[PDB]
Amino acid sequence: VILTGNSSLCPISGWAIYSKDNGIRIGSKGDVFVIREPFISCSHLECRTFFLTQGALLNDKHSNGTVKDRSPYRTLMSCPVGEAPSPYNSRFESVAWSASACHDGMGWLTIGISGPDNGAVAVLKYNGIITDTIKSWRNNILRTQESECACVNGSCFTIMTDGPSNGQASYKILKIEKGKVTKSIELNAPNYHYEECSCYPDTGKVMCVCRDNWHGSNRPWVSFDQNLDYQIGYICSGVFGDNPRPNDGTGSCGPVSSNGANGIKGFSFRYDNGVWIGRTKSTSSRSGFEMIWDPNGWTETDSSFSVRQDIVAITDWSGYSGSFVQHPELTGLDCMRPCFWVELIRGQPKENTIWTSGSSISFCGVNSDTVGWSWPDGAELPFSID
Amino acid sequence: VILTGNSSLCPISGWAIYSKDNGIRIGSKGDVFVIREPFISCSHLECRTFFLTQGALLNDKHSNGTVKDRSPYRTLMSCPVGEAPSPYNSRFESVAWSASACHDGMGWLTIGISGPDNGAVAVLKYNGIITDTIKSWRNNILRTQESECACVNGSCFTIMTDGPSNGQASYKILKIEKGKVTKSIELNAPNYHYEECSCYPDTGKVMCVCRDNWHGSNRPWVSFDQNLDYQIGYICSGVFGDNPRPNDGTGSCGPVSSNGANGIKGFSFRYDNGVWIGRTKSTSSRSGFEMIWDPNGWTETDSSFSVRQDIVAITDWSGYSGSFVQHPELTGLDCMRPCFWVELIRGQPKENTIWTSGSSISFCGVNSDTVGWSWPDGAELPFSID
Amino acid sequence: VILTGNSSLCPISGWAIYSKDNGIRIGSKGDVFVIREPFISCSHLECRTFFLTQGALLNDKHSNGTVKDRSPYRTLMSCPVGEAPSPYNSRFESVAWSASACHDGMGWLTIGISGPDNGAVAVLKYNGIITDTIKSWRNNILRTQESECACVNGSCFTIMTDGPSNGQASYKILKIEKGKVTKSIELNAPNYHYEECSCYPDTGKVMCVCRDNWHGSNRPWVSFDQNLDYQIGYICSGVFGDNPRPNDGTGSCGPVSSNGANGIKGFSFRYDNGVWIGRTKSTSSRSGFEMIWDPNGWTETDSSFSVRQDIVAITDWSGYSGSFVQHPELTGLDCMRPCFWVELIRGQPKENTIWTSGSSISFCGVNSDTVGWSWPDGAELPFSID
Amino acid sequence: VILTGNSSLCPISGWAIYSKDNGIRIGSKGDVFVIREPFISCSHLECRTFFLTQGALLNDKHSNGTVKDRSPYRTLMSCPVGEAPSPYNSRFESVAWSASACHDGMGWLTIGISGPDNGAVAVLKYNGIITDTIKSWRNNILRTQESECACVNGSCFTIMTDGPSNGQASYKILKIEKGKVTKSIELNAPNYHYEECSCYPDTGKVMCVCRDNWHGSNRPWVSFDQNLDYQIGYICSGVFGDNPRPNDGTGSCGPVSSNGANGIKGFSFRYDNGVWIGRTKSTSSRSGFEMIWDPNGWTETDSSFSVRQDIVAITDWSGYSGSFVQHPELTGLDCMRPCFWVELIRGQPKENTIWTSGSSISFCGVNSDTVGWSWPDGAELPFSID
Ligand SMILES: *[C@@H]1O[C@H](CO[C@@H]2O[C@@H](C)[C@@H](O)[C@@H](O)[C@@H]2O)[C@@H](O[C@@H]2O[C@H](CO)[C@@H](O)[C@H](O)[C@H]2NC(C)=O)[C@H](O)[C@H]1NC(C)=O
Ligand SMILES: *[C@@H]1O[C@H](CO[C@@H]2O[C@@H](C)[C@@H](O)[C@@H](O)[C@@H]2O)[C@@H](O[C@@H]2O[C@H](CO)[C@@H](O)[C@H](O)[C@H]2NC(C)=O)[C@H](O)[C@H]1NC(C)=O
Ligand SMILES: *[C@@H]1O[C@H](CO[C@@H]2O[C@@H](C)[C@@H](O)[C@@H](O)[C@@H]2O)[C@@H](O)[C@H](O)[C@H]1NC(C)=O
Ligand SMILES: *[C@@H]1O[C@H](CO)[C@@H](O)[C@H](O)[C@H]1NC(C)=O
Ligand SMILES: *[C@@H]1O[C@H](CO)[C@@H](O)[C@H](O)[C@H]1NC(C)=O
Ligand SMILES: *[C@@H]1O[C@H](CO)[C@@H](O)[C@H](O)[C@H]1NC(C)=O
Ligand SMILES: *[C@@H]1O[C@H](CO)[C@@H](O)[C@H](O)[C@H]1NC(C)=O
Ligand SMILES: *[C@@H]1O[C@H](CO)[C@@H](O)[C@H](O)[C@H]1NC(C)=O
Ligand SMILES: *[C@@H]1O[C@H](CO)[C@@H](O)[C@H](O)[C@H]1NC(C)=O
Ligand SMILES: *[C@@H]1O[C@H](CO)[C@@H](O)[C@H](O)[C@H]1NC(C)=O
Ligand SMILES: *[C@@H]1O[C@H](CO)[C@@H](O)[C@H](O)[C@H]1NC(C)=O
Ligand SMILES: *[C@@H]1O[C@H](CO)[C@@H](O)[C@H](O)[C@H]1NC(C)=O
Ligand SMILES: [Ca+2]
Ligand SMILES: [Ca+2]
Ligand SMILES: [Ca+2]
Ligand SMILES: [Ca+2]
Ligand SMILES: [Ca+2]
Ligand SMILES: [Ca+2]
Ligand SMILES: [Ca+2]
Ligand SMILES: [Ca+2]
Ligand SMILES: [Ca+2]
């Protein structure tokens, strides 16, 4: 089957909890990878958690976090959703310190970037066979989504960035068919900054909501059709989505400069003029998580919103978050179902350990009754290795 | 295939041992979840053990019992019958501190309740995809069976409770089709109390035998057809089924008030006016287990019975128990086979440990020779974490 | 696919090594069951190692030997051939302190005996579903092969013993179809003793070579056709097959009384008037292993033989051994291939540990070049738990 | 599916990283085999890592390297590519201290050599069933490739050696069909030395590049067609391929005598008159790894070359390396894709441990952009067992 991707996002009123892996609690005794960015991606048959590991287990000396993030040991692996990421249940995908994956209905596409900062190379695999490579074109840390790419009608789409993370860089949309790049376009986006995009298919097109690490505390977006004809902007809501960020106030259709430097991987779902925003509860640290429905937040700059659903209390650590979808071929629904995952980061720099890892929770949007709560990581730090 | 569920319970004379997982003995060294309620549920192809875990392993500090039962860490998992429940052999099912699951012949239905005490939400999944939610309607600990639901002719049925565990609460029957609630009915049951129901199909209808936590030391039951027309009662036998309970004597068709408060999840199988009762051997603690055949015990209040089969000796810990069936589509028989599982609880509050866990045994009803014995947990407590 | 079982044993000249699991060496660190009798059985698709475990892991306190052999914790498990038997790679089969298993071409039959000594019950499963039970008929430790049963033309056959292990007992052949006992016969075998039979199919019939624990240091045998017409005798060769045994000398077609009490599970393959004998190298302890070809040893009493192939040196521990076959439906050959497994027992009573376990090696008969060697267990005892 | 093997090697410009297993880093805490020679072999559906283990885990006393290399404990296993080789994810293949494996499109062939030095026996398996044996014909350590065999048109091909490793030995090509040897030829190769061959299919023929342990610091080669008509030579490039070796200088069509004794398993790919050479960076120790393209290096003796791609830095340990291919039936390409693996050896003799093991990296040849880097093992030695 080919995922057609022609349906629209399902109407939803809230988010129902889908998974929680308790990876760090389990890794206190079991053999569990130290991981980051545990993104979920689904096929027409199953959902999988992808993640990056340094090839080290929790509570082992090799978890010592003084290793660089872009190291030669870092690999992309995947395990079933909701399971602790272990060498005994994880499939190897690619050598990678930056990554993406998605399924077009016939096979898994994985994208793994490795190599040195001045000449990194993305290796594209389709069903685990190398099908293409993309080399850094600006020689300054080629990097990609750290969540699932989006597939429409037999083609898959991703965003890659090359250049500074504290200034103007270069952004490319890629169209990939059976793992071969068939088209690429560099965005003409002066004064924009795109990193770590969350992209989802919707009505035959793709929407990506990303991270401005240069000078925006609201999130940039880019949407495009199957030929990579594109539009760009920033989410206008004064419910600002990045972290760090200022207190909610008047937004902008351009980058909001106050507290704009630095950031966090996040996501949002557009519903016409409205937007569902996932964000941390703290404005200054990666703490808490909440879903906010702003019925005019895509296009209007006020800070008013209609619904807030709690996900993680502000007293608990959160982390990266990303979108994923479940297509009709998987669900049997007539619409595209939006979902998201949250990474719950424990360890350095906020806690007195030698290591850093995340566990994950995930939710799916439903048009039935839901409830806010807090589903935090739950591990008791420090560990015995510390 | 659709499980028709139109056949009657097989004639049986005793219980043959089906599985034993040795989970706690193995968890002394291996990586084994701390678990509760390991109920079994079967498809037309296989049987699985479902269980709730806090995401903690035996002999690890996170197994510390001080965590509340309704925590955000609690998840429903499943593994093959008879295997130690490990993070390396277990499937994730749902985030849940109360749960149910069953198979209709075409897919697994799982029901997992999480969220706060005043607004819990049951997430319904079919083949692992969220298909519906049910929110608390009394705002007082929505909770369900902790054993398998019952499927007949393409619909699956379960019982949910909301309200006090020491007084009158509210009880609903649900009819579920492919994970969607298609009908629900509130029982009109003043002075009844229903919790932790064990439900099985029989001749196109469902029978549930439950736990009266309020004021009954015999077990209440409810049976209903596919339109949710229902009957309610209490098992009349003077062989009382709950724990705690009084000494055997004259029973009642209503709740037996002596020692009626508190209780334990249990089960029974009705055969016309007779009943097979599974119960602890002790009247005051969760110790021992036995199967009693009382040929007039469903409807008559005397305490005489015909057959007793030992399952666990009175000197050994037992725990929760539940029914499961094997349908003709799985066994090739022309009747519905009754089976049951027993949880063997070790640790708190009876033993000097920081943790509480169960292991499991299970038995199938057969019309051939059987024997009583004792198949206890067998772990040597305390563990080194203690 | 039904295994016809109508072919004869392949002509062979020696034994080629098939598998070695290194179970005890691996279990010094990994999570590995303490096991006994690791017998192999094959289907038309795969070969599996079955084994009995006490539900305890090597190097853990629950491996403490003081538990009796016939305990309620003992279970039959299986894993792929050549893998260390772990809770993470093993399938649960049955609760059992004595067992057998085989595949008829369409499904696995397992036989598991549990319960008390005076009333044990064999539980029969077909495809993991209970299909029959057999209760002790002499109330004195019902017991069976501890190796694979034999299947011919849709029926499987096994031997069960009930009664004394130091005197005359009672022996039954069972005919089983889809897990249901369809016929049984009690052997008329005064002065014979049958235990722990190794049975293989050959030309539409079954041949079993067993253990005389009463008063024979040669091995008894029983052969029968699909109607359970049977013949009985003892292997005549002065190359005595049991352990303990006298030095090789003049054999007997009846039980050889010298060193006759006690014994060890073993096997032999009949080729007309000749026999392949597997035995320990020591006459007094379970040390070493060798295959001997005696071209007239089935029917003649001399102690001369033609070929000896070393398997385990006399300076290394051996243990139980049993036959298995690979049918033409598995191999594509036009004959029945004979194979055997050997258990290498470490620990009590010969070594200063708290535990006893076995690892396994296996060999297949081939008509090409082979070599003798020693393939011992290789663990360094004692372990840290000792 | 029969792999035709009639295509030629794909044109390539560099090497893209395919896998990294981090086995030793993970095995610091996880249950991971001590391994050597982790060679990769692919079917039409998947790629697997084969390896030899002594049946011991990292960080356990049985990893003590005083056990000889040709021991009875040594076994050939396989696991998915990129996963740490563990007893929980590895399938058993054969008892072997020297081994080879490949897939003909319909099934796995494995060759495992065991037994004594003066009479070793290769056991050939097809789909895990013993199909043939080959006994030592010179009684002096029969040994084979330690990498994948080459399959063309329903036949698989391998090289075996018997005789001295410091003098003239005897070399045989084998043609194997469904695991049965159908033809063999002894090379007429006076003054040549062939060990540990890396063989690949190319245009209906097989090319093997090997290790001269006697007196060559360049590598010998043998190529042959499906009838085992063959040609022999040595790689002429003054870019010497063995380790140890002299500094780059004038090559030879025969064995280069300077530093010729001893060696390391390696590989090369012929492209007309040019050659891609994989070699260590150090001339004196097993350190570093690089790929060199020499456009006239197959047939000319100068030390000039065109392209160097770094794989492992000279300050990090490397080890054995070998070729593998991905056939068009797996990739969908119209050519034969060349790939290679590198073993990263840690421990004795270079480091102060009791053990020796390898982890692995692998690369595939592509005609797109690539980059040099260093992907070393990354474990911190010594371990706590030391
Ligand atoms: C078994 O179920 C069938 C299936 O029909 C159900 O009808 C829906 C209302 C809903 O309950 C779904 O689960 C099913 O699809 C029953 O057949 C139907 O019965 C109704 C009324 O009796 C009739 O109007 C329909 O036409 C029937 N449909 C079909 C396809 O036959 C059937 O009654 C059930 N059998 C028993 C013994 O209860
Ligand atoms: C590819 O193989 C076919 C088949 O050859 C047979 O099968 C092989 C597995 C092996 O057993 C060979 O020895 C067999 O001959 C070859 O086709 C055969 O060619 C011969 C003449 O050379 C002819 O007599 C047969 O009839 C052919 N058989 C079939 C089924 O076509 C073919 O030549 C091989 N191709 C190459 C390039 O060598
Ligand atoms: C082989 O089996 C055939 C099938 O019939 C059998 O019938 C009953 C009695 C059982 O024994 C059951 O296992 C089988 O289904 C026979 O017709 C045939 O005679 C048997 N013997 C042969 C072919 O030699
Ligand atoms: C998508 O396209 C298919 C035809 O290819 C059509 O049947 C279906 O209704 C379309 N869905 C939407 C939501 O447009
Ligand atoms: C962690 O790494 C740093 C840098 O290599 C090292 O200096 C430090 O001592 C390490 N700490 C531990 C606990 O391993
Ligand atoms: C989908 O792809 C197919 C072939 O790749 C093409 O016919 C069509 O233009 C695309 N668009 C839609 C809406 O199907
Ligand atoms: C159930 O339905 C099947 C098929 O209609 C029938 O063969 C079977 O006998 C029925 N059983 C009962 C008890 O109605
Ligand atoms: C268990 O939890 C209690 C709760 O405060 C804590 O005080 C105690 O130290 C814990 N014990 C262990 C062994 O972790
Ligand atoms: C066994 O039966 C099969 C089925 O027809 C036949 O092909 C084969 O030759 C028979 N073998 C013997 C030894 O009778
Ligand atoms: C083993 O079991 C016996 C049984 O009583 C016990 O007395 C002994 O202390 C145990 N030994 C160890 C080392 O656990
Ligand atoms: C290999 O043989 C097949 C036979 O059908 C042919 O189609 C294919 O093109 C051939 N390839 C080459 C490279 O000769
Ligand atoms: C390793 O093996 C040798 C061989 O007997 C032994 O002498 C030595 O003490 C062992 N060392 C360790 C650390 O186990
Ligand atoms: Ca920002
Ligand atoms: Ca607004
Ligand atoms: Ca009660
Ligand atoms: Ca009664
Ligand atoms: Ca461990
Ligand atoms: Ca004897
Ligand atoms: Ca003789
Ligand atoms: Ca050399
Ligand atoms: Ca040159």
Which chain D positions have a beta carbon within 8 Å of A140's beta carbon?
A: none
Residue A154, phi-psi category: left (phi > 0), alpha (psi -120 to 50), beta (remainder): left
Please indicate if any CB of chain C lies within 8 Å of the CB of B87: no
Q: Is A165 in the pocket of ligand 4 (CB under 6 A)?
A: no
Residue D82 near chain A (CB below 8 Å):
yes
- Token look-up 């939006």 returns A338
- Residue D363 near residue D7 (C-beta atoms within 8 A): no
Task: Measure the CA–CA gap between C174 and C206, rounded to whole angstroms.
Answer: 12
Ligand 4 centroid distance, CA of A332 (Å) = 13
Whether omega for the bond prior to residue B295 falls within 30 degrees of 0, making it cis, is: no
Helix (H) or strand (E) holding C331: helix C328-331
Q: Residue B236: which of B204, B213, B270, B208 has the closest Cα?
A: B270
**Residue A344 contacts by C-beta under 8 Å, 6 or more apart in sequence?**
A24, A312, A316, A317, A318, A319, A358, A359, A360, A361, A376, A377
Look at residues D284, D266, D276 and name the one whose alpha carbon lies nearest to residue D320: D266
Query: Residue C29 C-alpha to ligand 17 middle, in angstroms?
Result: 7
Cα–Cα distance, D174 to D186 (Å, whole number):
9
Instruction: Search chain A and give the residue with CA nearest D379.
Output: A62
Contact (Cβ atoms closer than 8 angstroms) between residue C265 and residue C318: no
Per-residue DSSP letter, D149: -
Q: Is the C-alpha dihedral spanning B76, B78, B81, B85 positive or negative?
A: negative
Nearest to B49 by CA among B122, B116, B146: B146
Start-to-end CA distance of chain C, whole Å, equals: 49
Starting from the edge strand earliest in sequence, which strands make up the sheet with A337-347, in order?
Answer: A14-20, A356-366, A337-347, A321-326
- Across C61-116, where does the E strand assignment appear? 75-80, 91-95, 98-103, 108-114
Cα–Cα distance for residue pair D65/B88, rounded to 1 Å: 30
CB burial of residue A107 (10 Å; 0-12, 13-18, 19+): middle
What distance in Å separates residue C82's CA from the closest CA in chain D?
Answer: 5
- What 8-state DSSP symbol labels residue D223? E
Please answer yes or no on whether A25 and B114 come within 8 Å at the CB atom: no
The backbone region for B188, taken as left when phi is positive above 0, alpha when psi lies in -120 to 50, beta otherwise, is beta
3-state secondary structure of A204: coil
What are the residues whose beta carbon lies below 5 Å from ligand 14 (ion)? A 294, 296-297, 302, 304
**Contact D302/D250 with Cβ under 8 angstroms?**
yes
Give D70's Cβ-side CA count (13 Å radius).
Answer: 16
**Residues facing residue D109 across a β-bridge:** D102, D126
Contact with chain C for residue D330, Cβ under 8 A: no
Amino acid at residue number D267: F
- Spatial neighbors of A68 by CB under 8 A, at least 6 apart, are none
Helices (H) and strands (E) in chain B — how many of each?
2, 24
Report whether D358 contacts D53 (CB < 8 A).
Answer: no
User: Residue C35 and residue C32: Cα distance in Å, rounded?
Assistant: 9
**Cα dihedral sign, D246-D249-D255-D258:** negative
Q: Which of B194, B185, B186, B176 has its CA nearest to residue B122?
A: B176
State the ligand closest to the CA atom of B166. Answer: 15
What would the DSSP string read from start to end of D91-130? EEEEE-SEEEEEE-SS-EEEEEEES-TTS-EEEEEETTEE
CB atoms within 10 A of CB C318: 30
Dist. CA D11–CA B297, nearest whole Å: 83
For chain B, how long is the longest CA-to-CA vector?
A: 54
Distance CA B189, CA B181 (A): 22
Residues 6+ apart with CB under 8 A from A359: A20, A21, A22, A23, A24, A25, A38, A343, A344, A346, A377, A379
Tell me the three state secondary structure of residue B289. strand
Alpha carbon distance A380, C352 (integer Å): 41
Question: How far apart are alpha carbons D97 and D121 in whole angstroms?
Answer: 11
Q: How far apart are CA D93 and CA A315, in angstroms?
A: 52
Helix then strand then coil, % of chain D, to nearest 5: 5, 45, 50
In Å, how far are A96, A285, B296, D257 from D267, measured between CA atoms?
26, 52, 82, 19
- Give A91→chain D minimum CA distance, Å: 7
Distance CA D12, CA A234 (A): 43
| Bond prior to C11 in cis (omega within 30° of 0) | no
Instruction: Using the structure block, give the residue that is written with the tokens 């063997």.
Output: B344
Subunits adjacent to chain B (3 or more Cβ pairs under 8 Å): A, C
Is the CB of residue C100 less than 8 Å from the CB of residue C146?
Answer: yes
Length of chain D: 386
Dihedrals φ, ψ of B194, to 5°?
-120, 125
- Of D267, D205, D197, the C-alpha closest to D230 is D205
Strand partners, A277: A268, A292
Are the C-beta atoms of residues B220 and B265 closer than 8 Å to each other? no
**Rounded distance, CA B219 to CA B28, Å?**
36
Is the CB of residue C154 below 6 angstroms from any atom belonging to ligand 3?
Answer: yes
Ligand nearest to the Cα of B180, by number: 1
d(CA C262, CA C283): 12
Beta bridge partners of A381: none
Q: Mark out the alpha helices in chain D (DSSP H runs).
A: 23-27, 328-331
Residues 6+ apart with CB under 8 A from B206: B150, B152, B157, B199, B200, B223, B224, B225
C182: phi then psi, degrees, rounded to nearest 5: -105, -15
**N-term to C-term CA, chain B:** 49
Which residue stretches of chain B are H helix? 23-27, 328-331
Distance of CA A379 to the CA centre of its chain: 23
Quick check: C24 and C67 in contact, CB under 8 A? no
Per-residue CA distances from B347 to B59, B316, C172 (Å): 12, 12, 45
**DSSP-based helix, strand, coil % in chain C, nearest 5:** 5, 45, 50
Read off φ and ψ for residue A45, nearest 5 degrees.
-125, -35
Neighbours of D69 (CB within 10 A): 12
Are the CB atoms for B92 and B77 separated by under 8 Å?
A: yes
Sheet with B75-80: strands ordered across: B33-42, B47-57, B75-80, B91-95
A245 in helix, strand or coil?
coil
- Strand A205-211: give its sheet, edge to edge: A195-202, A205-211, A220-224, A230-234
Residue of C200, C234, C320, C377 marked active site: C320
Residue D295 buriedness (CB in 10 A; 0-12 / 13-18 / 19+): middle
**Residue C311 CA, ligand 18 centroid: distance in Å:** 22
Separation of CA B335 and ligand 7 centre (Å): 10
Return d(Cα A106, Cα A83) in angstroms, integer.
Answer: 24
Identify whether the C-beta of residue D272 lies closer than 8 Å to the C-beta of residue D251: no
Enumerate the domain spans of chain B.
1-386
E strand or H helix at D55: strand D47-57
Cα within 13 Å of Cα(C245), Cβ side: 29
Q: Which of C20, C47, C332 minimises the CB distance to D75? A: C20
**Dihedrals phi, psi of A7, to nearest 5 degrees:** -85, 165
Q: D1-386 maps to which CATH number?
A: 2.120.10.10
- Rounded to an integer, what distance in angstroms lies between the CA atom of residue D313 and that of residue C94? 54
Question: Residue D166, SS3?
Answer: coil
Phi and psi at residue A212, to the nearest 5°: -95, 105
Are A361 and A50 spatial neighbours (Cβ–Cβ below 8 Å)? no
Rounded CA gap, D355 and D386, in Å? 8
CB D162 within 8 A of CB D195: no
Pick from A273, A236, A233: nearest CA to A251: A236
Distance of alpha carbon A235 from alpha carbon A242, whole angstroms:
11
Are D160 and D143 a contacting pair, CB within 8 Å? yes
**Cβ(A35)–Cβ(A386) below 8 Å:** no
Q: Which of A89, A327, A331 is nearest to A200 (CA)?
A: A327
Structure token pair of residue C58: 């090597």
Q: How far apart are CA C76 and CA C54, in angstroms?
A: 9
Q: Which residues, 6+ apart, have CB-to-CB distance to B67 below 8 Å? A: B54, B56, B73
Q: Is the dihedral of CA C105, C107, C108, C111 positive or negative?
A: negative
Q: Which of D211, B328, D213 is nearest to D221 (CA)?
A: D211
Vertex A269: Cα angle to A265 and A271 (nearest 5): 160
- Burial readout B125-159 (b: 16 or more C-beta within 10 A, e: otherwise): bbbbbbbbbbbbeeebbbbbbbbbbbbbeebbbbb
- Distance in angstroms (rounded) separating the CA atoms of residues B351 and B240: 26
Distance, CA of A30 to chain centre: 27
The answer to whether the bond into B164 is cis (omega within 30° of 0) is no
Q: Residue D320 catalytic?
A: yes
